[PDB]
Every structure is written in C-alpha cells, then in structure tokens.
Amino acid sequence: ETKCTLKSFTVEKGIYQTSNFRVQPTESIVRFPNITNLCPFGEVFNATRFASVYAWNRKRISNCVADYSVLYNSASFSTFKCYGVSPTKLNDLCFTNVYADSFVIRGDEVRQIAPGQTGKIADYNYKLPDDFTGCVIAWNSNNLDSKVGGNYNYRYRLFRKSNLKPFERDISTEIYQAGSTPCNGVQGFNCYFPLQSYGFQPTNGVGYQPYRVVVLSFELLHAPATVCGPKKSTNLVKNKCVNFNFNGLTGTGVLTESNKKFLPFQQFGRDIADTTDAVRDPQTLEILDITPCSFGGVSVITPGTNTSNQVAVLYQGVNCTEVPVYSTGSNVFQTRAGCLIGAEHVNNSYECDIPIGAGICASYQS
Amino acid sequence: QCVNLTTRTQLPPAYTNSFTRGVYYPDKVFRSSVLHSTQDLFLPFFSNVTWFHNPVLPFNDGVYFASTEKSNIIRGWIFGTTLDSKTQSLLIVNNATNVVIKVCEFQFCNDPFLDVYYMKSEFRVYSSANNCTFEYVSQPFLKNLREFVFKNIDGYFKIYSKHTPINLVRDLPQGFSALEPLVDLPIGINITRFQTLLALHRAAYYVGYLQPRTFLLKYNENGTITDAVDCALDPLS
Ligand SMILES: *[C@@H]1O[C@H](CO)[C@@H](O[C@@H]2O[C@H](CO)[C@@H](O)[C@H](O)[C@H]2NC(C)=O)[C@H](O)[C@H]1NC(C)=O
Ligand SMILES: *[C@@H]1O[C@H](CO)[C@@H](O[C@@H]2O[C@H](CO)[C@@H](O)[C@H](O)[C@H]2NC(C)=O)[C@H](O)[C@H]1NC(C)=O
Ligand SMILES: *[C@@H]1O[C@H](CO)[C@@H](O[C@@H]2O[C@H](CO)[C@@H](O)[C@H](O)[C@H]2NC(C)=O)[C@H](O)[C@H]1NC(C)=O
Ligand SMILES: *[C@@H]1O[C@H](CO)[C@@H](O[C@@H]2O[C@H](CO)[C@@H](O)[C@H](O)[C@H]2NC(C)=O)[C@H](O)[C@H]1NC(C)=O
Ligand SMILES: *[C@@H]1O[C@H](CO)[C@@H](O[C@@H]2O[C@H](CO)[C@@H](O)[C@H](O)[C@H]2NC(C)=O)[C@H](O)[C@H]1NC(C)=O
Ligand SMILES: *[C@@H]1O[C@H](CO)[C@@H](O[C@@H]2O[C@H](CO)[C@@H](O)[C@H](O)[C@H]2NC(C)=O)[C@H](O)[C@H]1NC(C)=O
Ligand SMILES: *[C@@H]1O[C@H](CO)[C@@H](O)[C@H](O)[C@H]1NC(C)=O
Ligand SMILES: *[C@@H]1O[C@H](CO)[C@@H](O)[C@H](O)[C@H]1NC(C)=O
Numbered sequence: 001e002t003k004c005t006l007k008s009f010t011v012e013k014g015i016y017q018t019s020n021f022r023v024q025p026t027e028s029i030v031r032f033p034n035i036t037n038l039c040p041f042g043e044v045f046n047a048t049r050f051a052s053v054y055a056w057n058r059k060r061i062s063n064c065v066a067d068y069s070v071l072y073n074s075a076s077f078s079t080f081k082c083y084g085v086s087p088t089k090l091n092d093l094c095f096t097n098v099y100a101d102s103f104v105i106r107g108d109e110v111r112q113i114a115p116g117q118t119g120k121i122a123d124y125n126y127k128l129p130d131d132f133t134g135c136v137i138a139w140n141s142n143n144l145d146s147k148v149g150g151n152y153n154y155r156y157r158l159f160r161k162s163n164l165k166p167f168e169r170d171i172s173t174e175i176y177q178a179g180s181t182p183c184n185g186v187q188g189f190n191c192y193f194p195l196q197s198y199g200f201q202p203t204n205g206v207g208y209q210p211y212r213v214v215v216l217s218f219e220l221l222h223a224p225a226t227v228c229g230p231k232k233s234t235n236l237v238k239n240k241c242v243n244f245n246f247n248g249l250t251g252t253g254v255l256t257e258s259n260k261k262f263l264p265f266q267q268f269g270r271d272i273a274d275t276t277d278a279v280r281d282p283q284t285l286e287i288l289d290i291t292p293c294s295f296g297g298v299s300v301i302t303p304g305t306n307t308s309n310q311v312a313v314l315y316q317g318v319n320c321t322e323v324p325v326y327s328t329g330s331n332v333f334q335t336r337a338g339c340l341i342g343a344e345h346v347n348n349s350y351e352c353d354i355p356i357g358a359g360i361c362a363s364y365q366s
Numbered sequence: 367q368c369v370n371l372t373t374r375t376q377l378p379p380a381y382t383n384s385f386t387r388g389v390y391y392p393d394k395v396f397r398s399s400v401l402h403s404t405q406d407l408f409l410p411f412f413s414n415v416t417w418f419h420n421p422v423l424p425f426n427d428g429v430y431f432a433s434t435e436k437s438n439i440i441r442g443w444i445f446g447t448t449l450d451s452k453t454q455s456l457l458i459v460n461n462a463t464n465v466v467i468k469v470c471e472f473q474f475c476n477d478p479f480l481d482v483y484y485m486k487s488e489f490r491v492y493s494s495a496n497n498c499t500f501e502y503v504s505q506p507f508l509k510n511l512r513e514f515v516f517k518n519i520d521g522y523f524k525i526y527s528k529h530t531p532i533n534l535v536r537d538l539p540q541g542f543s544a545l546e547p548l549v550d551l552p553i554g555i556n557i558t559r560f561q562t563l564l565a566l567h568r569a570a571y572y573v574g575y576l577q578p579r580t581f582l583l584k585y586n587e588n589g590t591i592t593d594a595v596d597c598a599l600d601p602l603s
C-alpha cells in the first residue's frame with residue numbers, strides 16, 4: 001500500500017503516511033435507575049369484593065410503573081382479549097391515567113364486553129367505544145363469588161328506556177312503564193323493575209358461574225405520559241471501548257473510575273465546547289469518566305526498495321496495548337511518538353537520517 | 367367556612383432595590399472552573415422589587431418570592447387563572463407535617479386563610495373541591511430568609527429554593543447565593559395570577575418579576591455558582 005499510495009513501482013528511502021488505525025466498539029450497555037414505584041394493580045385485581053355490573057368500579061391510575069408482564073403470563077386469568085394494542089408491546093408504549101373498570105358478571109355474557117358489541121348488559125350497564133384502546137381481562141370466580149344457597153348479592157340492569165352510551169355509568173333505579181299508563185311506583189301492569197338479581201350457584205354449569213371482569217383503558221392526551229413499563233437495564237463494564245445509553249444520554253467511548261465530586265443534584269459534566277466527560281450511573285450513584293476510543297494514522301518506514309525489502313510500521317499517538325497480519329511481527333517498542341513494530345531499540349547514538357519524532361529516529365543496518 | 371374579612375389589613379406597597387439576588391442553576395450539568403454565558407429568564411440586577419409589610423398579583427412569566435419571616439407565618443400559595451371551580455387550579459400548602467401539592471378545580475372565598483386556635487388546627491382556605499387531577503406529598507420545606515423562584519414552562523412547574531440566616535433588619539442583604547433546583551411538577555396550568563396564605567391568630571415579603579436576558583456565570587472547582595454578571599446593565603458589563 002506504500003507503493004499504491006505513491007503510484008510507483010520503486011520507492012525512495014523515508015517515512016510515508018498511509019491509512020488511519022481506529023479501535024472499534026465491542027458491545028453495548030444500558031443503565032436506568034432502580035425500578036421502583038411499582039404500580040398498585042393488586043388492589044384492583046385481588047380485591048375481596050367487586051361492584052355490580054350497573055355500578056362498575058371505576059379507578060384512575062397515574063404516576064406509577066406498570067408491570068404488565070406478570071399479568072401477561074398470569075395463567076389464572078382466562079380472557080385476555082383486545083385488539084387495539086398488542087399485548088406484548090404494552091411495556092414499550094407509554095401512557096397516562098389508565099382507567100380500570102371492574103365488576104362481576106355471568107360467564108355467558110363475557111363476550112358482551114367488546115368494541116361494537118351488543119347484548120343484555122353491553123348496551124344497558126357498560127358500553128364500550130368502537131375505537132377502544134384497551135384490554136379486557138376476565139376470569140372465573142365461581143368458588144368465590146357464589147353461595148351454595150345461591151349468590152343473590154349481584155344485580156344487573158334489565159329494562160331501560162334507551163341504550164347506554166360508551167363509557168357511561170347509570171345507577172338510577174326507577175320503575176319502568178311498558179305500556180300507556182303510569183306506574184306511580186306500583187309493580188302493576190306494564191311495570192317491571194329495571195334491576196334483577198343474579199342467581200349464581202356453585203353447581204351451575206359453565207356460563208352460569210360468576211366471572212370477574214376488568215377492562216383497562218389507555219389514554220394519551222396532551223399532558224406528559226407517566227404510566228408504562230420498567231425499562232430493563234444491562235450490567236456495567238469498564239476499561240473497554242464500548243457504547244452506552246446512560247439514562248438516555250448515549251455515546252461511544254471507554255469508561256473508568258473518577259474522583260470528581262458532583263453536587264448532589266447533577267447527572268453529568270462537560271468541560272468546554274459541549275463535550276461530555278463524566279456521568280453518574282442511576283443505580284450505584286457514582287461518578288465515571290468517559291474518554292474516546294483510540295485513533296490515529298499509521299506510517300511506514302522504509303530504507304528504499306532499491307536497497308532492501310523489509311519495512312517498519314509506526315502507530316502514532318497510540319498506546320502500545322491495542323496493537324492489533326503484522327499484529328506481532330518483531331519486538332515492539334513504545335515511544336512518545338507512539339508504538340513502533342519491526343525495529344530494534346539500541347543504546348548507541350548516531351546521526352539522524354529518517355526522523356521519527358520526539359528526538360528519536362531510525363536507520364538501516366536490519 | 368370563610369367569609370369576607372372586615373379587617374382590611376394594609377400592607378404598604380413600597381419599592382426597594384433588588385441588588386444582585388435571584389440567581390438559580392439553569393440546568394443539571396456539572397462544570398468546574400469555567401465561565402459560561404447563558405441566555406435565559408432572570409431577574410435583572412438593581413431593579414425595583416415590591417415590598418409588602420393578601421392582594422391578588424399577576425404571575426407574568428415567572429416569579430421571584432422572598433420573605434425574611436420568623437416563626438413561619440407564611441403558609442402556601444394558590445395558582446391559576448380565576449381561582450374557581452370553573453377552571454383548573456393549583457394549590458400548595460406547607461403545614462407542620464409533610465407539604466401537600468394539589469391540582470383540582472378548587473373554589474375559594476374572597477379572603478382565603480388558615481387561622482390557628484390556641485388545639486392548633488384550622489383550615490378554611492377554600493369552599494368546594496369537585497374535580498381533581500393531580501396530587502402529591504413531600505417533605506416540609508422549612509433571622510432567616512427564604513427565597514423561592516417559580517417558573518411554569520411546557521407543562522412543567524419548576525420550584526427553586528434557598529434559605530439563609532440573616533441579621534440585617536429591613537432590606538435585602540447585599541450578598542450572592544445561587545438557588546439550587548428544588549422540585550419539578552409535570553402538570554400543565556395556564557397560570558396567570560397567584561395569591562398567598564398566612565397564619566393568623568384566632569408580615570413583610572418581597573415580589574419580583576423575571577425577564578429574558580443574557581448572564582455570565584462563574585463556576586468554582588466543585589461546580590457551585592459563585593458569582594454572575596449581567597450583560598445588559600452597564601457598558602463595562
Ligand atoms: C438499587 O437497588 C440495588 C438492589 O438492591 C441496591 O443494591 C444494594 O442495596 C442494598 C440495600 O439498599 C445495599 O445494602 C447494598 O449495598 C447495595 N449493593 C451495592 C451498592 O452493591 C442499590 O443500593 C440501590 N441503589 C439506589 C440508589 O437505590
Ligand atoms: C498504556 O496503558 C497502560 C495501561 O493503563 C499504562 O500502564 C499503566 O502505567 C501506569 C503508570 O506507570 C501504572 O500506574 C499502571 O499500573 C499501568 N497499568 C497497567 C495495566 O500496566 C501505560 O503507562 C500506557 N502507556 C504509556 C506510554 O503511558
Ligand atoms: C398537615 O396536613 C395534612 C393534610 O394536608 C394533615 O393530615 C395528613 O393527611 C395525609 C393525607 O392522607 C395523611 O396521609 C397523613 O397521615 C395525615 N397526617 C399527618 C401528615 O400527620 C396533617 O395532620 C397536617 N399536619 C398538622 C396539622 O400538623
Ligand atoms: C377534570 O379536570 C381534568 C383536567 O383539568 C379534565 O381532564 C381533561 O381536561 C381537558 C381540559 O381542556 C380536556 O381537554 C380533556 O379532554 C380532559 N380529559 C379527560 C380524560 O377528561 C377532566 O375532564 C375534568 N373533569 C370534569 C368532570 O370536570
Ligand atoms: C393555554 O391556553 C391555550 C390557548 O391560548 C390553549 O391552547 C388551546 O388548547 C385547546 C385544547 O387542546 C385547543 O382546542 C385550542 O385550539 C388551543 N388554542 C391555541 C391557540 O393553541 C392551551 O391548551 C392552554 N393550556 C393549558 C395548560 O391550559
Ligand atoms: C470544594 O471541594 C474541596 C475538595 O473536597 C473542599 O476542600 C476540602 O475542604 C475540607 C473542609 O475544610 C478539608 O478538610 C479538605 O482538606 C479540603 N480538601 C482539599 C483537597 O482542598 C472545599 O472545601 C470545597 N469547597 C470549596 C468552596 O472549595
Ligand atoms: C393476585 O394474587 C395472585 C396470587 O398470589 C398473584 O399471582 C397475582 O399476581 C396477584 N395480582 C396482582 C395484580 O398482583
Ligand atoms: C541503490 O542505491 C545504491 C546506493 O545506496 C546505488 O549505488 C545503486 O545504484 C542503487 N540502485 C539502483 C538505483 O537501482
């Protein structure tokens with residue numbers, strides 16, 4: 001390549017510049033603060049009692065780190081139904097003020113909780129929007145929400161003057177006039193109560209057992225989002241040319257221990273011209289340095305192809321540790337100019353003919 | 367629980383000299399032994415700052431608030447546009463225990479106050495609280511002066527704080543002390559005006575406004591801002 005750069009088949013004695021050596025990163029590391037503030041979902045999923053279908057429990061959720069993997073792998077739940085958001089990508093997506101609507105219904109009517117779905121309780125008790133961005137989780141609770149004498153504590157809305165709008169909760173208990181005469185609070189002709197009790201029994205078959213059903217609604221409005229996954233982190237390595245993503249601040253380099261004393265509220269530092277120099281890992285809370293990976297040109301020292309054929313190679317401004325066909329070659333010498341391979345260091349001193357630098361130079365004997 | 371207060375206390379609206387106070391850390395970056403020029407919202411040097419010995423005051427862009435209070439009579443703050451349930455509003459209360467930050471459609475009376483009984487418990491600042499959006503609780507904040515800087519940018523409410531013992535009687539001391547960043551809140555309110563809360567038994571504070579301009583800050587070895595220079599005050603500057 002000396003000949004190729006010179007574009008000649010014969011080369012004169014001297015030292016010539018060539019391509020640039022540069023170290024490459026090995027792997028990647030990511031660090032995020034201690035995953036805490038776990039979002040309180042057990043209080044709504046493992047609550048002792050749930051509300052009626054017509055008076056479903058509505059809860060708001062914000063400022064929490066939600067672990068949806070455990071529910072995703074939860075084998076206790078049977079219905080994990082939703083299409084608006086892919087179930088495995090919840091941890092990636094970030095939202096705010098997730099809504100939880102929980103109740104207990106019959107097993108047969110669990111299908112009624114779906115976008116664009118009708119039925120007996122879908123259009124009367126809890127109606128879903130056609131553009132629903134959420135997910136419904138349902139599971140049998142016959143052993144808990146039923147009585148051997150009959151669970152009569154759960155009621156559902158049966159008769160209504162009109163349907164129910166999506167995301168509407170109507171708990172009004174008023175007599176219904178089914179004819180052309182007022183009821184006046186009398187269960188007379190064309191007069192039926194709007195609420196009817198459930199008849200849950202342990203001996204009831206599949207579809208008649210009480211199922212606990214809760215829908216999660218994800219909304220993302222102009223205010224900043226705050227509810228999403230834990231953002232798993234990797235481990236920490238040192239003294240290696242890598243690339244890093246420290247709490248969103250990303251870049252390449254090599255990291256070492258440092259003795260800087262950050263004031264207790266900073267996260268990183270820089271010297272001049274916007275060049276980051278130190279960081280603080282969000283878990284150990286210690287200060288680490290950053291230096292760029294080594295680079296620099298290479299040069300070839302030759303006595304002239306007329307005289308001999310062997311050469312020497314100089315990596316300038318590079319520590320003699322990340323040396324690597326000429327990875328080993330001959331004995332390697334380290335000088336203030338860089339690292340030299342293919343030459344032998346002596347203790348004599350003569351005139352200078354091929355200047356190398358820092359007060360040293362080379363000649364042909366080897 | 368509160369009605370119009372007949373005892374219309376008069377706090378004389380005097381003017382005094384801002385001197386060189388009201389400098390806060392503008393970001394969260396460590397710098398050592400460097401001089402950095404930055405353009406941001408600050409309180410211009412040697413300006414008229416209003417001194418009161420609870421009127422409604424405009425918020426403008428940001429507010430520098432100070433009080434050399436003793437026995438901690440200052441209680442809290444109210445923020446919003448109309449300070450009614452008709453509009454989203456914000457409230458800060460700093461009682462004996464943990465401070466409480468609230469964001470709801472609160473309804474106050476003409477004269478909101480706390481009052482104390484001598485048994486030390488009384489709270490009749492507002493009337494109704496129907497729709498709530500944000501809640502938060504933190505550690506209590508508090509011869510000694512307390513300074514705070516309030517900013518509201520991009521749905522982020524930023525509070526910077528600093529308290530320092532004092533010995534001078536009336537005016538603000540002619541010293542320098544940077545303001546470290548205390549709290550950030552991720553709630554958006556189109557605040558236009560604000561108020562104040564006192565502790566009455568059953569009063570001097572200073573207010574200044576911010577402006578956008580350019581400053582030069584000097585960092586010491588440990589990264590603490592130790593002095594600053596305005597860039598639009600004097601030709602020497
Ligand atoms: C982040 O969490 C880790 C996991 O526990 C903490 O590591 C240990 O925490 C215990 C108790 O806090 C300490 O007694 C150990 O000394 C920690 N191990 C270390 C430091 O190697 C870690 O302390 C947590 N850090 C923060 C800032 O919360
Ligand atoms: C090239 O890098 C190595 C590795 O850091 C340097 O060796 C260090 O030298 C210092 C100074 O004598 C010692 O305190 C360390 O213990 C050494 N570390 C190792 C792993 O040997 C070496 O000095 C560097 N090259 C030059 C020319 O300074
Ligand atoms: C200070 O105000 C709070 C309410 O703003 C008082 O009550 C506390 O309320 C919170 C909110 O649920 C509870 O978690 C605390 O347990 C309550 N007690 C505390 C913090 O002591 C509180 O009593 C007030 N402190 C006083 C009057 O000294
Ligand atoms: C209670 O207040 C909150 C916040 O002020 C309201 O939530 C949002 O308010 C903005 C105001 O412009 C609306 O544009 C959004 O559509 C609201 N989002 C949601 C999810 O409601 C909330 O609407 C208020 N509720 C009541 C009953 O007043
Ligand atoms: C502050 O006021 C501005 C209006 O000057 C609000 O911007 C409006 O927001 C609503 C709700 O999204 C939009 O329908 C309007 O088109 C917006 N108008 C303009 C001119 O932008 C802004 O949302 C308010 N912010 C807060 C936090 O109250
Ligand atoms: C800045 O940091 C330095 C380094 O810790 C501080 O200097 C130390 O101060 C303590 C307290 O007087 C001494 O015991 C140490 O011997 C000092 N060490 C050194 C290396 O000087 C210094 O106090 C801090 N603050 C300022 C304003 O410089
Ligand atoms: C409810 O309890 C079961 C049994 O321990 C548990 O597996 C499940 O994770 C709990 N639910 C939540 C939301 O934590
Ligand atoms: C090679 O160099 C020697 C002297 O160093 C010279 O005598 C000889 O002629 C050269 N050979 C060539 C130019 O082919």
Ligand SMILES: *[C@@H]1O[C@H](CO)[C@@H](O)[C@H](O)[C@H]1NC(C)=O
Pocket residue numbers: 344345346347
């Ligand atoms: C001669 O040089 C070699 C390395 O080139 C060195 O190890 C040795 O100590 C030197 N000896 C003297 C006497 O200078």
Ligand SMILES: *[C@@H]1O[C@H](CO)[C@@H](O)[C@H](O)[C@H]1NC(C)=O
Pocket residue numbers: 381382383384412413414415
């Ligand atoms: C405040 O304004 C008055 C006039 O109202 C003026 O005399 C005084 O110098 C001003 N003080 C300042 C700008 O610090």
